[PDB]
């Protein structure tokens, strides 16, 4: 959509002249966005996981996949197959729409916003972020919700380094430091 053709028209040229590439598709491009939370407290209240899934469905136009514990761990008294988290993968048009609607409105609505860190890359151009609360998103009316559950946004790009990931994300008007 708007962010996608903005990228196509402007960011490709900007990054190409910035890094002195030689091919059109050597510029890093964002390939997916993953929104998940491991509710943890679904050991005993399975309705909590359904409420979180409804929250994610409201936030992003997809039905969340319920993720279960891979290995039994005795520390948190869970075993194999227990539904623990919810996850949504966004690609293409929906990814671009959510990318617009996050950094245009939802981030400004953060209480006492100061700026997202720049050293939060895994070393391969990927980004991760914790919203710490689900109420900021416009898809929420601040009264339907019952808890303080927060997401974990992960932006997966084809960048070859955290430097190029920083460059790509700063080409999209990210509120860094």
Partner 1 sequence: MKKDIHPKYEEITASCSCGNVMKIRSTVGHDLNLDVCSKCHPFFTGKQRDVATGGRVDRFNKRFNI
Partner 2 sequence: NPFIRFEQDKKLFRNALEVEGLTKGFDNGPLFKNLNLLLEVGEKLAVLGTNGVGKSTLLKTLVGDLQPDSGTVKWSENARIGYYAQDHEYEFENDLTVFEWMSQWKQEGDDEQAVRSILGRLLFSQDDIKKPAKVLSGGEKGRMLFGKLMMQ
Which residues touch 159 (CB under 8 Å, ≥6 apart)? 28, 124, 125, 126, 165, 168
Closest among 116, 129, 130, 119 to 162, alpha carbons compared: 119
Matching residue, tokens 């929250």: 55
Minimal distance, residue 92 CB to RNA, in Å = 15
Among partner 1, partner 2, RNA, none, what binds residue 25 when CB lies within 5 to 8 Å by partner kind? none
What gap in Å lies between CA 79 and CA 82, rounded to an integer?
A: 6
Confirm or reject binding of residue 14 to RNA (CB under 7 A).
Answer: no
Q: Which of 72, 104, 128, 161 binds partner 1 (CB under 8 A)?
A: 104
Closest among 3, 18, 10 to 163, alpha carbons compared: 18
Binders in 30-89 for partner 2, by CB under 8 A: 43-47
Site string for RNA, 57-96 (x = CB under 7 A): ----------xxxxx-x-xx-x-----xxxx-x-------
The H-assigned helical ranges of 20-126 are 46-59, 93-101
Binders in 51-80 for partner 1, by CB under 8 A: 57-58, 61-63
Indicate the SS3 state at residue 125.
Answer: coil
Minimal distance, residue 62 CB to partner 1, in Å = 6
Quick check: 156 and 33 in contact, CB under 8 A?
A: yes
Residues that bind RNA (CB under 7 A): 34, 36-41, 43, 67-71, 73, 75-76, 78, 84-87, 89, 117, 120-124, 126-132, 148-152, 154, 156
- Residue numbers of the site for partner 1 (CB under 8 A)? 1, 57-58, 61-63, 97, 100-101, 103-105, 107-109, 113-115, 138-139, 173, 175
């Amino acid at each position: 959509a708007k962010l996608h053709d903005y990228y196509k028209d402007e960011v490709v040229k900007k990054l190409m002249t910035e890094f002195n590439y030689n091919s059109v598709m050597q510029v890093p491009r964002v390939e997916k966005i993953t929104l998940n939370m491991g509710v943890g407290e679904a050991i005993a209240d399975k309705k909590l996981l359904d409420n979180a899934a409804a929250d994610l469905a409201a936030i992003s136009g997809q039905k969340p996949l319920i993720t279960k514990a891979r290995k039994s761990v005795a520390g948190f008294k869970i075993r194999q197959g227990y539904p623990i988290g919810c996850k949504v993968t966004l690609r293409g048009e929906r990814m671009w729409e959510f990318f617009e609607r996050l950094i245009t409105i939802a981030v400004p609505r953060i209480r006492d916003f100061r700026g997202l860190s720049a050293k939060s890359f895994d070393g391969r151009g990927n980004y991760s972020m914790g919203v710490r609360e689900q109420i900021i998103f416009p898809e929420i009316d601040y009264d339907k919700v019952d808890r303080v559950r927060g997401l974990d946004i992960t932006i997966t790009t084809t960048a070859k380094s955290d430097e190029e990931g920083r460059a790509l994300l700063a080409a999209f008007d990210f509120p860094f430091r």
